[PDB]
């Protein structure tokens, strides 16, 4: 019980993802906000939410649907909050102090812009809680924009191969930078200094669904549900199996114990953090969470903030103390088997012979069907079954007909009914068949209507013959069920 | 005029949560604002129907996706995809090149091709093919496919040096393990088999493909309680399996439960009965029982499944001499001496049946031919001796 809980709440309709969702200072003397650029309901109304505490304190309407939210500081200018650079459309709304501050516009396309789908930030030189970080955007068009600390040019362009969807970037931008890029296509490709194109690709045979960056290894969770440890050199170290789907990875990182360890968000109603090979701390909820957050919201340096596929907000707040079925056999078989023993060769005799006229009566049966035509599945490939539906004077009588061969279609073929037309009123008794294509079941059906008053369950024949012959190619019966008629 | 993919990012991120619930409407939203011509929609929606069973409607729409961007050598590989999870191979390969003359660096091209021409049975292309998808990118499931060509046309000295360089790499693959062991057991190699069957079994302990050859290699040498403790261990997962219950039944024919042992041959013959396997131990368990009737019964079946054996002649030869038929006994012994090129006990049999028949003048001639073809047996030693010195 490492997690001690603090809010669990069902009616906070909060459908916001693991990347749209950030918490850092917004006003100075440190109280931690946590804003985020929630959807609708559905996905119709976007709208942004910051929360302070575990109460709403402004919600207010956004222009596109925010494809990420991370924070970063601008200057170090006596250092107030990080601006807020929220991702919509074509556009970054930079908010200071959760106000309207700016609106970068990216540099359109020889008319056919781009939109922006991730967004993260890095670092310049110093890296500590003071630093100025830039941002790095990825444009839905292949492309990696390194913008500048404010937000309004350009420091460098990278050439991806395809659309990315989720970013990593460790180090320093100006002498070691490592930018990793989870696109569609299920690849991760890293981007180092002098490098346009990455030229260190990975494949994780199917789509990421999250990244996270730790300082060393790189996990990559796959829709396999399962997690896989590279390098930063593109070698995979380790790879770990995951009991169901995996809906939303961050990172838990506490520096009190210098613990830096992927999340995990399953699809079977728990949430696993994950180091570089061991299970700790798994939690449950009572519905699959679709987004976590692990940082100082509040006032706390542990908060870990976490929100229901259906909606509602969960926070919790980490505490600083972390043989066979064999069978039986009976009298009779033992008895049976002295039998046998006793009197094996009358019984070898008397099998054979019994087979011999078996093997005689079965090929006399088989030559008197192939008289009568009577075999429903006979070099001249065919199939036909009848079948009847429905009670009551009228039945439908739908025959199933095909040719069963490689390809070779049947063209002249017809079918004749033969009945008691004292009993069956058949409407036309012999008609033509379609022109049979090899492999497809034609259903050709008729109404047969009983006459007689009276209950009386006569058999129907079918026969399917040539044209030019007179011999039936095959034959079928049908008894026809009781009228209940009127 | 508005942004043509406005909600790409929303559509993915749903789509790769396995939704496809959301991700569904957030697509016919964004299909009915911009009339088509998303190529995002369209795509994602067609991925969806092929994670369902539908591969029909999946190909429609992605030849929708090819003709909205005809120059994109994924939508070409998708087509050629989508018809390749049909039947047709042919126009898969015909579609692959096509998606291979806009992209000539990629190794899925070449992967499916190769196991498209697998399936047409054309080797050479095949072969090469799989080849160069090794050196653009190695994948085991190209190894897998080079070692199922190098299987299918010829023999396993070209499949052992696949395999071993397969394994080299990513040795986590139960099935590559699997495999190359059970190619070891293919072979006269017992040991590097064990070897890598057990490492197998670490990963994987209740594997089932790898339980029951490492069983069926325990029962050959002995130690029939080892292996019936490793079908124990699967017992439950696969409670109805012939050829489980077959080696369980012979399991319990090597220590003398001979009962024990028909009951379970007999269950696995009922589930399986044109097994032809299980009827050769029926009737080879019928013998040692000395019940003569069913013996012959069972390995005449045998022999109607495989007539191209020559242990089975033998065999159904040793139940006709006891069922006063020496006549058929002679001809299947003739045609088991004909069928049979390396084992002796058909020859010390006949040359036995010949010597009993107050012959003893054929009987050195199937004596001598024992001897040109010799070793292990106890019993088929000393009446080896004994029909020498007998004769």
Same mark, same amino acid.
């Given at each position: 019980?490492?997690?001690?809980?603090?809010?669990?709440?069902?009616?906070?309709?909060?459908?916001?993802?693991?990347?749209?969702?950030?918490?850092?200072?917004?006003?100075?003397?440190?109280?931690?906000?946590?804003? !985020?650029?929630?959807?609708?309901?559905?996905?119709?109304?976007?709208?942004?939410?910051?929360?302070?505490?575990?109460?709403?304190?402004?919600?207010?309407?956004?222009?596109?649907?925010?494809?990420?939210?991370?924070?970063?500081?601008?200057?170090?200018?006596?250092?107030?909050?990080?601006?807020?650079?929220?991702?919509?459309?074509?556009?970054?709304?930079?908010?200071?102090?959760?106000?309207?501050?700016?609106?970068?516009?990216?540099?359109?396309?020889?008319?056919?812009?781009?939109?922006?789908?991730?967004?993260?930030?890095?670092?310049?030189?110093?890296?500590?809680?003071?630093?100025?970080?830039?941002?790095?955007?990825?444009?839905?068009?292949?492309?990696?924009?390194?913008?500048?600390?404010?937000?309004?040019?350009?420091?460098?362009?990278?050439?991806?191969?395809?659309?990315?969807?989720?970013?990593?970037?460790?180090?320093?931008?100006?002498?070691?930078?490592?930018?990793?890029?989870?696109?569609?296509?299920?690849?991760?490709?890293?981007? &180092?200094?002098?490098?346009? #194109?990455?030229?260190?690709?990975?494949?994780?045979?199917?789509?990421?669904?999250?990244?996270?960056?730790?300082?060393?290894?790189?996990?990559?969770?796959?829709?396999?549900?399962?997690?896989?440890?590279?390098?930063?050199?593109?070698?995979?170290?380790?790879?770990?199996? !995951?009991?169901?789907?995996?809906?939303?990875?961050?990172?838990?990182?506490?520096?009190?114990?210098?613990?830096?360890?992927?999340?995990?968000?399953?699809?079977?109603?728990?949430?696993?953090?994950?180091?570089?090979?061991?299970?700790?701390?798994?939690? &449950?909820?009572?519905?699959?969470?679709?987004?976590?957050?692990?940082?100082?919201?509040?006032?706390?340096?542990?908060?870990?903030?976490?929100?229901?596929?259906?909606?509602?907000?969960?926070?919790?707040?980490?505490?600083?103390?972390?043989?066979?079925?064999?069978?039986?056999?009976?009298?009779?078989?033992?008895?049976?088997?002295? #039998?046998?023993?006793?009197?094996?060769?009358?019984?070898?005799?008397?099998?054979?012979?019994?087979?011999?006229?078996?093997?005689? #009566?079965?090929?006399?049966?088989?030559?008197?069907?192939?008289?009568?035509?009577?075999?429903?599945?006979?070099?001249?490939?065919?199939?036909?079954?009848?079948?009847?539906?429905?009670?009551?004077?009228?039945?439908?009588?739908?025959?199933?007909?095909?040719?069963?061969?490689?390809?070779?279609?049947?063209?002249?073929?017809?079918?004749?009914?033969?009945?008691?037309?004292?009993?069956?009123?058949?409407?036309?008794?012999?008609?033509?068949?379609?022109?049979?294509?090899?492999?497809?079941?034609?259903?050709?059906?008729?109404?047969?209507?009983?006459?007689?008053?009276?209950?009386?369950?006569?058999?129907?024949?079918?026969?399917?013959? #040539?044209?030019?012959?007179?011999?039936?190619?095959?034959?079928?019966?049908?008894? !026809?069920?009781?009228?209940?008629?009127? | 005029?508005?942004?043509?993919?406005?909600?790409?990012?929303?559509?993915?991120?749903?789509?790769?949560?396995?939704?496809?619930?959301?991700?569904?409407? *957030?697509?016919?939203?964004?299909?009915?604002?911009?009339?088509?011509?998303?190529?995002?929609?369209?795509?994602?929606?067609?991925?969806? =129907?092929?994670?369902?069973?539908?591969?029909?409607?999946?190909?429609?729409?992605?030849?929708?996706?090819? =003709?909205?961007?005809?120059?994109?050598?994924?939508?070409?590989?998708?087509?050629?995809?989508?018809?390749? /999870?049909?039947?047709?191979?042919?126009?898969?390969?015909?579609?692959?090149?096509?998606?291979?003359?806009?992209?000539?660096?990629?190794?899925?091209?070449?992967?499916?091709?190769? *196991?498209?021409?697998?399936?047409? +049975?054309?080797?050479?292309?095949?072969?090469?093919?799989?080849?160069?998808? /090794?050196?653009?990118?190695?994948?085991?499931?190209?190894?897998?496919?080079?070692?199922?060509?190098?299987?299918?046309?010829?023999?396993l000295?070209?499949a052992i040096?696949?395999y071993k360089?397969?394994v080299?790499?990513?040795?986590?693959?139960?099935?590559?393990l699997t495999t190359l062991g059970l190619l070891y057991l293919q072979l006269g190699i017992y040991q590097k088999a064990f070897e890598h069957l057990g490492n197998t /079994?670490?990963?994987?302990?209740?594997?089932?493909?790898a339980?029951?050859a490492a069983?069926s290699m325990?029962?050959?040498?002995?130690?029939?309680?080892?292996?019936?403790?490793?079908?124990?261990?699967?017992?439950?997962? *696969?409670?109805?399996?012939?050829?489980?219950?077959?080696?369980?039944?012979?399991?319990?024919?090597?220590?003398?439960?001979?009962?024990?042992?028909? @009951?379970?041959?007999?269950?696995?013959?009922?589930?399986?009965?044109?097994?032809?396997?299980?009827?050769?131990?029926?009737?080879?368990?019928?013998?040692?029982?000395?019940?003569?009737? @069913?013996? =012959?019964?069972?390995?005449?079946?045998?022999?109607?499944?495989?007539?191209?054996?020559?242990?089975?002649?033998?065999?159904?030869?040793?139940?006709?001499?006891?069922?006063?038929?020496?006549?058929?006994?002679?001809?299947?012994?003739?045609?088991?001496?004909?069928?049979?090129?390396?084992?002796?006990?058909?020859?010390?049999?006949?040359?036995?049946?010949?010597?009993?028949?107050?012959?003893?003048?054929?009987?050195?001639?199937?004596?001598?031919?024992?001897?040109?073809? *010799?070793?292990?047996?106890?019993?088929?030693?000393?009446?080896?001796?004994?029909?020498?010195? +007998?004769?």
């Amino acid at each position: 019980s490492k997690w001690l809980d603090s809010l669990s709440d069902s009616m906070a309709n909060i459908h916001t993802f693991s990347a749209c969702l950030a918490l850092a200072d917004f006003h100075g003397d440190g109280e931690y906000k946590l804003a !985020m650029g929630d959807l609708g309901p559905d996905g119709r109304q976007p709208r942004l939410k910051v929360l302070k505490g575990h109460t709403l304190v402004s919600q207010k309407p956004l222009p596109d649907l925010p494809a990420a939210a991370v924070t970063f500081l601008m200057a170090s200018h006596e250092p107030r909050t990080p601006a807020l650079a929220i991702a919509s459309g074509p556009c970054v709304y930079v908010y200071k102090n959760l106000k309207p501050y700016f609106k970068f516009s990216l540099p359109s396309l020889p008319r056919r812009q781009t939109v922006i789908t991730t967004m993260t930030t890095l670092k310049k030189n110093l890296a500590d809680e003071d630093a100025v970080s830039c941002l790095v955007l990825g444009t839905e068009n292949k492309e990696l924009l390194v913008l500048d600390p404010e937000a309004f040019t350009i420091l460098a362009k990278m050439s991806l191969p395809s659309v990315p969807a989720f970013l990593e970037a460790s180090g320093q931008f100006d002498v070691e930078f490592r930018l990793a890029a989870a696109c569609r296509n299920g690849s991760i490709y890293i981007l &180092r200094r002098d490098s346009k #194109r990455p030229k260190y690709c990975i494949e994780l045979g199917a789509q990421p669904v999250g990244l996270v960056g730790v300082h060393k290894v790189l996990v990559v969770g796959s829709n396999q549900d399962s997690l896989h440890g590279f390098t930063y050199k593109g070698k995979r170290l380790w790879t770990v199996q !995951m009991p169901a789907a995996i809906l939303a990875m961050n990172l838990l990182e506490q520096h009190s114990r210098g613990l830096q360890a992927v999340m995990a968000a399953l699809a079977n109603e728990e949430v696993r953090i994950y180091h570089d090979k061991v299970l700790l701390n798994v939690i &449950r909820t009572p519905e699959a969470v679709t987004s976590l957050c692990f940082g100082r919201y509040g006032r706390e340096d542990n908060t870990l903030i976490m929100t229901t596929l259906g909606g509602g907000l969960i926070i919790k707040i980490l505490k600083r103390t972390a043989k066979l079925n064999v069978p039986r056999k009976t009298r009779l078989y033992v008895d049976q088997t002295l #039998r046998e023993r006793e009197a094996g060769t009358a019984m070898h005799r008397t099998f054979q012979a019994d087979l011999y006229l078996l093997r005689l #009566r079965a090929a006399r049966a088989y030559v008197q069907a192939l008289e009568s035509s009577l075999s429903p599945v006979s070099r001249e490939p065919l199939k036909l079954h009848a079948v009847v539906q429905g009670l009551g004077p009228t039945f439908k009588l739908t025959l199933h007909l095909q040719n069963t061969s490689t390809a070779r279609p049947i063209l002249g073929l017809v079918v004749c009914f033969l009945y008691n037309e004292v009993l069956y009123a058949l409407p036309r008794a012999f008609f033509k068949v379609p022109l049979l294509v090899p492999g497809l079941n034609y259903p050709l059906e008729t109404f047969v209507k009983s006459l007689s008053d009276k209950g009386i369950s006569d058999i129907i024949k079918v026969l399917v013959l #040539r044209e030019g012959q007179s011999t039936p190619l095959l034959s079928a019966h049908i008894n !026809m069920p009781m009228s209940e008629g009127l | 005029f508005p942004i043509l993919e406005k909600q790409n990012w929303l559509i993915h991120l749903y789509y790769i949560q396995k939704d496809y619930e959301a991700c569904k409407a *957030v697509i016919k939203e964004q299909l009915q604002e911009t009339h088509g011509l998303c190529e995002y929609a369209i795509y994602v929606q067609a991925l969806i =129907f092929r994670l369902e069973g539908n591969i029909q409607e999946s190909l429609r729409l992605f030849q929708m996706c090819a =003709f909205l961007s005809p120059q994109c050598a994924d939508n070409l590989k998708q087509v050629a995809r989508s018809l390749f /999870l049909l039947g047709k191979h042919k126009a898969a390969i015909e579609v692959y090149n096509e998606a291979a003359k806009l992209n000539q660096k990629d190794w899925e091209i070449c992967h499916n091709l190769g *196991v498209c021409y697998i399936y047409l +049975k054309q080797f050479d292309k095949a072969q090469d093919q799989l080849h160069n998808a /090794l050196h653009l990118n190695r994948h085991d499931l190209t190894y897998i496919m080079l070692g199922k060509i190098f299987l299918l046309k010829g023999d396993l000295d070209k499949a052992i040096e696949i395999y071993k360089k397969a394994v080299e790499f990513s040795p986590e693959n139960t099935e590559l393990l699997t495999t190359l062991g059970l190619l070891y057991l293919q072979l006269g190699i017992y040991q590097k088999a064990f070897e890598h069957l057990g490492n197998t /079994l670490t990963y994987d302990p209740t594997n089932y493909k790898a339980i029951l050859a490492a069983g069926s290699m325990m029962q050959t040498h002995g130690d029939f309680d080892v292996a019936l403790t490793k079908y124990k261990v699967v017992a439950c997962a *696969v409670i109805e399996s012939p050829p489980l219950w077959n080696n369980i039944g012979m399991c319990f024919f090597g220590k003398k439960k001979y009962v024990a042992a028909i @009951s379970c041959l007999k269950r696995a013959n009922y589930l399986a009965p044109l097994d032809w396997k299980i009827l050769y131990n029926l009737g080879l368990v019928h013998l040692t029982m000395q019940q003569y009737a @069913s013996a =012959f019964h069972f390995l005449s079946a045998a022999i109607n499944f495989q007539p191209k054996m020559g242990e089975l002649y033998m065999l159904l030869a040793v139940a006709l001499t006891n069922l006063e038929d020496s006549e058929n006994a002679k001809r299947a012994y003739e045609e088991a001496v004909r069928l049979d090129k390396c084992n002796p006990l058909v020859n010390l049999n006949y040359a036995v049946l010949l010597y009993n028949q107050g012959e003893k003048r054929d009987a050195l001639a199937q004596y001598q031919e024992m001897e040109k073809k *010799v070793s292990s047996s106890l019993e088929f030693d000393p009446e080896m001796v004994e029909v020498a010195q +007998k004769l």
